[PDB]
């Protein structure tokens, strides 16, 4: 509490309102100037990059960015404009410009104009509260720009100034004698929600009359398109409601018109809720400590975190298949010279994971900040006499250990289940022998087709149920190995691994057929013989989301489901009967019998072709029905996978793993039960320890629990990233086209570890992304310097280094070096910067898994 600690804590709560208000208004104005520049960065003369690409789908949907507009403009407004001083537009003049460049420049300028003015008006409230300020204090870096000192004594934002430099003439909100103004923060909740309702109404008027998207049901009967004037329902997506990439009319609320009708809906709701609160503001005793801005800061901030998580979820679904993003896949997208696989989905993934990441940070930081309010209360005596039940509901220390311990138990059980299943199935997929057990892989041999006429040597047991049976090789009467055709494989049969070409399982010798004539519920339309070893395909159904999704889809699609089932049925019967006819040919034994047989097969054949084409086309019609929750790349149903089931369990376990430190902040900011047995009392929110006593105590403060939340949460977050970008999370080594994935029509990019090496071969083909990869790795491992129990070693070595450098200064007569003292971070600041370095390392590196492309092929 003397070093660097007073720099990132210089602006703490509570604060006066004019100071919060003006500072927010200035940030708003600054964020509008930055978006201004992003509009300039989106014009059509620039390369694709990750900024202008995250904005383009939305700019298309608004009609600002026209995808099919090539005509160059040469005059538009004021007379004669080939190019000027910076030219016809400042510096945009050497370029050829279209209408969408002008729209983009118009919107960019507005943003910059309205931003700059919001910055000024915000400084009028901010500096105006203080009576006013000087150009030299506002800007502060003008003292050392000699000359300009006569215009750095001028006072701005003053109370009685001439109009153009006034600030707040009555000094503060509370003194100004306007009765409309509300005097507390509860009271003010009402005009705030009226103001927000009005911002909605503004966006809908702009949508309707400036962007020309009327609200449903007042949509136009026709729209203008690059091919002329077209009925709304046939005009393609940016212009009308017809989705080209799915080839269907869009629901009316799936369009930007749907969005302008919701503008008016939401606006009316917010205005009415504000009118209600104008007569009935919040009042209960449970809430009146929230007038302190330090306390509401906790409520608001972790609320916004939850809002951010909810944006991620809603946005993901709503837009995973929307024509805004798919339209990027036809725009010849080139980044750092390259050509991207599926840039639509990539950009979509980046926006949703960016919201996800904001959600975690703000929830955690809101809780941390709340822990600071509560520690304050304890350390001044008034925690024990808080009156709101939102504090007092959790004061009993024994309830606090019951809450925490059962959320540890729930975390434990569900993480053990998830991770334990991942481990079981990587054992299965890798065919590992443990001596005590042999893991066995999925393997499939087609049994219909022409592949069902391929022969195999088969070792057949007689009676698996008599231990001490044994088996024999299937043979001819002549003694030589009979080749069994795949159609005649039976359950129990063993085939040599090396007759199948398998070199990856050298520890066991045979594949066992465990199921014949198998057709995947969801998968390829074929019939198979299977070794299910240890691979647990049933685990897909251990997912409550498998069942809700499939039940609702069955209900919407019941009678094509039913006909597809009857087609499969008729086909399996035809296959079986055709296999018996083929077998009578094989074993016919005398050409009279062999002609009779071949003539029977020749007569059944047309009918077996009919049943196959029937099954094929019902199974194709079934696989093109609309998705509910689990989706294709073309918004079609897919069954849930082992991957989806693992992701369900990992969300429960891993978010509880990551959030148990936050419950420790909320309950144990002053005393945990380990502290309370010793009589200890944590004296501040950020102390590093108090140890070596009792074995050592590093990491009990609230600041540290915040850092341990951030780390532990890296684990569910990376589950989310792998799952968005198409990794397979249910094992560690899944290969892209392994027999299981191929037979069950699953597309994935890798499998835990394998994903990592699989995506990085794509990452290596971009030299900007490989530079990012190198820098990312270096930031991270340096966090270890700062996080290991080693600060004393670093202090005592730094000291040797300082002595030495001062010896060199004194010897060589170099005055700048005879008093060097190297600065060595203390333990608290080492933990802060260690968490910073750990976090940023990891998440630059994750950006790369998204930036490489979306390789899921659906």
Ligand X SMILES: CNCCOP(=O)(O)O[C@H](COC(=O)CCCCCCCCCCCC(C)C)OC(=O)CCCCCCCCCCCC(C)C
Task: Summarize the annotated binding site for chlorophyll a as residue ranges.
Answer: 9, 11, 50, 58, 111, 369, 372, 419, 715, 768, 781
Part in contact with ligand 85N (CB under 6 A); list of ranges 434-442, 447-455, 486-494, 641-649: 434-442
Task: Select from ligand X, ligand BCL, ligand 2GO, none the partner in contact with residue 829, using the beta carbon and a kind-dependent cut-off of 5 to 8 Å.
Answer: ligand X
Should residue 801 be labelled a site residue for other proteins when binding is judged by CB under 8 A?
A: no
Between the CA of residue 243 and those of 63, 325, 347, 719, 858, what are the distances in Å?
15, 12, 20, 32, 19
- The pairing of strands 515-518 and 510-512 is unpaired
Q: What are phi and psi of 512, to 5 degrees?
A: -100, 135
Gyration radius of the chain over CA positions: 35
Residue list 392-451, contact with ligand 2GO (CB under 6 A): 415, 418-419, 422
CA-to-CA dists, residue 455 to 37, 447, 479, 491, 499, angstroms? 69, 11, 17, 16, 10
Binding mask of the shown chain, residues 774 to 803, with x at each position contacting ligand SF4 by CB under 6 A: ---------------x--------------
844 binds, among ligand 85N, ligand X, ligand CLA, none (CB under 5 to 8 A by kind): ligand CLA
- Smallest distance, Ca ion to C-beta of residue 752, A: 15
Query: Does residue 852 touch Ca ion according to CB under 5 A?
Result: yes
Strand partners, 460: 472
Q: How far is the CB of 839 from ligand SF4 (least distance, A)?
A: 21
Cβ partners under 8 Å of residue 296, min gap 6: 185, 290
Nearest to 737 by CA among 324, 348, 442, 518: 442
Candidate list 827, 836, 844, 845; residue touching ligand SF4; CB under 6 A: 827
Considering only 225, 392, 438, 826, the residue that binds ligand X (CB under 6 A) is 826
Residues 617-646 that bind other proteins (CB under 8 A): 627-629, 631
Among residues 132, 452, 520, 654, which is the contact residue for ligand 2GO, using CB under 6 A? Answer: 654
Closest to ligand 2GO by CB, 128 vs 727, is: 727
723 is a contact residue toward ligand X (CB under 6 A): yes
Q: Write the binding mask 351 to 390 for ligand X: x where contact by CB under 6 A, - elsewhere.
A: -x---x----------------------------------
434 binds, among Ca ion, ligand BCL, ligand 85N, none (CB under 5 to 8 A by kind): ligand 85N
Report in angstroms how near the CB of residue 658 gets to ligand BCL at its nearest: 11
Q: Which residues fall in the annotated binding site for Ca(2+)?
A: 725, 759, 849, 852-853
Annotated binding site: 9, 11, 19, 24, 38, 50, 58, 111, 125, 182, 192, 195, 259, 266, 289, 298, 300, 306, 354-355, 357, 362, 369, 372, 419, 689, 698, 715, 725, 759, 768, 781, 849, 852-853
- Chain contacts with ligand CLA (rule: CB under 6 A): 49-51, 335-336, 432-434, 768, 771-772, 775, 781-782, 784-785, 788, 790, 793-794, 797-798, 844
User: What three-state secondary structure class fits 729?
Assistant: coil
Of 777-836, binders to ligand 2GO (CB under 6 A) are: 777, 780
434 CB burial (10 A radius; 0-12, 13-18, 19+):
exposed
Among 91, 696, 781, 810, binds ligand SF4 (CB under 6 A): 696
Q: How far is the CB of 340 from Ca ion (least distance, A)?
A: 10
Complex with other proteins: residue 673 or 797, whichever CB lies closer: 673
**H or E stretch at 703:** helix 702-724
- Per-residue contact flags (x/-) with ligand 85N for residues 516 to 535, judged by CB under 6 A: ------------------x-
Q: Are 200 and 269 contacting, i.e. CB atoms less than 8 angstroms apart?
A: no
Quick note: the x/- pattern for ligand 2GO over 724-763, rule CB under 6 A, is -----x----------------------x---xx--x---
* Of the candidates 756, 721, 722, 751, the residue with the CA atom closest to the CA atom of residue 736: 751
For the chain, what is the largest distance between any 2 Cα atoms, rounded to a whole number of angstroms?
Answer: 120
* CB nearer to ligand X: pick between 127 and 728: 728
Angle at 311 between CA 308 and CA 317, to 5 degrees: 150
If one asks whether residue 703 binds ligand 85N (CB under 6 A), the answer comes out as no
Contacts of 480-484 with C-beta under 8 Å, sequence gap 24+, read 481/457, 482/457, 482/458, 483/455, 483/456, 483/457, 484/455, 484/456, 484/457, 484/458
User: Out of 18, 48, 641, 725, which residue is the one contacting Ca ion (CB under 5 A)?
Assistant: 725
Distance set, CA 326 to CA 241, 253, 371, 776, 818 (Å): 15, 18, 45, 31, 65
> Nearest Cα to 782, choosing from 717, 730, 830, 719?
830
Taking alpha carbons only, the member of 573, 709, 715 closest to residue 651 is 715
Choose the one of ligand 85N, ligand 2GO, other proteins, none that binds residue 803, judging by a C-beta under 5 to 8 angstroms depending on kind. other proteins
- Phi, psi angles (nearest 5°) of residue 445: -125, 120
Tell me if residue 242 falls in helix, strand or coil: strand
- Out of 25, 489, 650, 665, the only residue in the binding site for ligand 2GO (CB under 6 A) is 650
Shortest separation between residue 603's beta carbon and other proteins, angstroms = 28
Q: Which of 133, 421, 828, 848 binds ligand 2GO (CB under 6 A)?
A: 848
Question: Among residues 314 and 500, whose Cβ is nearest to ligand X?
Answer: 314
Tell me: does residue 691 bind ligand SF4 (CB under 6 A): yes
Considering only residues 46, 68, 437, 757, which one is a binding residue for ligand 85N as defined by CB under 6 A? 437
Q: What angle do CA 369, 374, 380 make, to 5 degrees?
A: 130
652/663 Cα distance (integer angstroms): 16
- Using CB atoms, what's the residue nearest to ligand 85N? 437
Give the binding range for ligand 85N (CB under 6 A) out of 26-34, 195-203, 432-440, 782-790: 432-440
Q: Give the bridge partners for 243, in sequence order.
A: 248
Nearest distance from C-beta of residue 734 to ligand X, angstroms = 14
CB contact at 8 A, 171 and 132: no
Site string for ligand 85N, 73-92 (x = CB under 6 A): --------------------
Phi, then psi, of 670 in degrees rounded to 5: -115, -35
Q: Which two tokens stand for residue 549?
A: 């999704």
CA distance linking residue 294 with residue 16, whole number of Å:
11
Among 99, 273, 454, 689, binds ligand SF4 (CB under 6 A): 689
Cα–Cα distance measured from residue 846 to residue 349, given in angstroms and rounded to the nearest whole number: 12
Q: Using the rule CB under 8 A, is 30 a contact of other proteins? A: yes
Considering only CA atoms, which of 649, 773, 777, 780 is closest in space to residue 723? 649
Report the C-alpha dihedral over residues 536, 538, 543, 545, rounded to 10 degrees: 120
d(CA 209, CA 232): 18
Q: Which of residues 630-669 bind ligand X (CB under 6 A)?
A: 630-631, 647-648, 651-652, 655-656, 659
Alpha-carbon distance values, 28 to 25, 59, 118, 325, 473 (Å)? 5, 21, 7, 28, 80
Would you tell me which residues interact with ligand BCL (CB under 6 A)? 295, 298-299, 302-303, 306, 309-310, 367, 370-371, 373-374, 388, 390-391, 394, 662-663, 666
Q: Are 612 and 571 in contact (CB under 8 A)?
A: yes
**Could you say which of ligand CLA, ligand BCL, ligand SF4, none residue 684 binds, taking C-beta under 5 to 8 angstroms by partner kind?**
none
Contact residues for Ca ion, defined by CB under 5 A? 725, 852
What are the residues binding ligand 85N (CB under 6 A)? 434, 436-437, 534
| Interaction site with ligand 2GO (CB under 6 A) | 415, 418-419, 422, 650, 653-654, 657, 714-716, 718-719, 722, 729, 752, 756-757, 760, 773, 777, 780, 841-842, 845-846, 848-849
């Amino acid at each position: 509490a003397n070093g660097v600690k007073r720099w990132y804590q210089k602006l703490e709560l509570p604060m006066p309102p004019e100071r919060i208000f003006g500072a927010h208004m200035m940030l708003i104005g600054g964020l509008a100037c930055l978006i201004g520049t992003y509009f300039f960065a989106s014009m059509t003369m620039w390369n694709d990059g990750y900024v202008n690409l995250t904005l383009r789908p939305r700019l298309i949907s608004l009609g600002i960015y026209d995808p099919y507009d090539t005509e160059q403009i040469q005059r538009v407004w004021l007379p004669l404009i080939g190019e000027f001083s910076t030219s016809k537009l400042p510096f945009f003049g050497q370029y050829p410009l279209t209408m969408t460049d002008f729209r983009l420049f118009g919107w960019g300028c507005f943003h910059i104009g309205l931003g700059l003015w919001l910055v000024y008006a915000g400084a009028a409230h901010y500096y105006g509260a203080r009576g006013g300020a000087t150009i030299g204090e506002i800007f502060w870096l003008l003292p050392y720009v000699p000359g300009l000192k006569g215009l750095c004594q001028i006072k701005w934002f003053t109370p009685e100034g001439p109009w153009y430099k006034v600030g707040l003439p009555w000094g503060s909100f509370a003194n100004t004698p306007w009765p409309i103004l509300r005097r507390t923060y509860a009271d003010a909740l009402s005009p705030h929600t009226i103001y927000i309702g009005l911002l909605f109404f503004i966006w809908g008027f702009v949508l309707w009359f400036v962007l020309d998207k009327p609200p449903v049901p007042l949509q136009p009967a026709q729209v203008m398109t690059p091919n002329g004037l077209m009925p709304l329902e046939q005009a393609p997506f940016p212009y009308g409601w017809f989705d080209p990439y799915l080839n269907q009319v869009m629901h009316p609320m799936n369009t930007i018109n749907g969005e302008t009708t919701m503008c008016f809906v939401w606006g009316v709701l917010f205005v009415a809720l504000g009118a209600y609160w104008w007569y009935r503001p919040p009042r209960s005793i449970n809430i009146t400590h929230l007038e302190d801005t330090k306390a509401v800061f906790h409520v608001h901030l972790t609320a916004i975190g939850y809002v951010s998580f909810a944006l991620a979820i809603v946005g993901f679904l709503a837009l995973r298949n929307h024509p805004s993003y798919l339209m990027l896949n036809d725009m010849n997208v080139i980044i750092y010279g390259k050509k991207i696989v599926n840039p639509g989905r990539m950009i979509h993934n980046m926006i949703t994971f960016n919201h996800v990441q904001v959600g975690l940070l703000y929830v955690a930081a809101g809780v941390f900040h709340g822990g600071q309010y509560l520690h304050g209360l304890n350390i001044s005596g008034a925690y024990k006499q808080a009156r709101s039940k939102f504090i007092t509901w959790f004061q009993n220390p024994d309830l606090q250990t019951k809450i925490v311990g059962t959320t540890m138990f729930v975390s434990f059980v569900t993480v053990v289940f998830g991770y334990g299943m991942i481990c079981w199935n990587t054992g299965a997929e890798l065919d590992l022998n443990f001596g005590i057990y042999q893991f066995r892989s999925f393997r499939a041999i087609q049994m219909d087709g022409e592949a069902g006429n391929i022969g195999y040597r088969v070792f057949r047991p007689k009676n698996p149920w008599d231990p001490t049976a044994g088996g024999d090789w299937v043979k001819n009467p002549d003694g030589t190995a009979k080749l069994v055709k795949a159609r005649n494989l039976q359950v129990g049969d063993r085939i040599l691994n090396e007759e199948l070409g398998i070199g990856s399982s050298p520890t066991y010798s045979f594949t066992t057929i465990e199921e014949i004539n198998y057709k995947p519920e969801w998968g390829q339309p074929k019939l198979y013989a299977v070794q299910w070893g240890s691979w647990t395909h049933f685990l897909r159904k251990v997912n409550p989301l498998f069942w809700v999704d499939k039940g609702i889809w069955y209900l919407q699609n019941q009678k094509t489901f039913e006909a597809t089932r009857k087609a499969d049925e008729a086909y399996l019967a035809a296959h079986l009967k055709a296999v018996s006819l083929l077998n009578q040919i094989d074993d016919a034994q005398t050409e009279e019998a062999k002609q009779k047989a071949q003539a029977e097969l020749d007569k059944f054949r047309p009918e077996l072709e009919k049943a196959h084409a029937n099954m094929l086309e019902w199974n194709e019609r079934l696989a093109s029905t609309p998705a509910v929750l689990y989706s294709n790349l073309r918004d079609q149903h897919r069954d849930g996978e082992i991957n989806d089931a693992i992701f369900f369990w990992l969300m429960i376990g891993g978010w509880l793993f990551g959030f148990i430190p936050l419950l420790r902040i909320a309950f144990h900011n002053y005393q945990s039960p380990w502290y309370r047995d010793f009589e200890w009392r944590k004296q501040s929110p950020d102390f590093p320890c108090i140890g070596p006593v009792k074995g050592g105590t590093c990491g009990v403060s609230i600041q540290d629990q915040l850092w341990f939340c951030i780390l532990f949460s890296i684990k569910p977050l990376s589950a989310i990233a792998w799952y968005l970008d198409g990794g397979w999370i249910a094992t560690m080594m899944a290969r892209g086209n392994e027999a299981y994935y191929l037979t069950h029509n699953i597309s994935h990019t890798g499998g835990v570890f394998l994903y990592m090496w699989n995506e990085t071969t794509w990452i290596w083909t971009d030299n900007h992304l490989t530079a990012m990869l190198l820098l990312g790795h270096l930031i991270w491992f340096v966090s270890f310097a700062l996080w290991f129990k080693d600060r004393g070693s670093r202090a005592e070595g730094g000291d040797i280094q300082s002595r030495w450098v001062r010896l060199m200064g004194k010897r060589l007569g170099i005055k700048t070096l005879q008093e060097v003292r190297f600065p060595v971070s203390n333990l608290a600041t080492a933990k802060l910067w260690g968490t910073v370095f750990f976090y940023t390392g990891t998440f630059v590196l994750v950006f790369l898994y998204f930036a490489d492309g979306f390789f899921q092929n659906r």
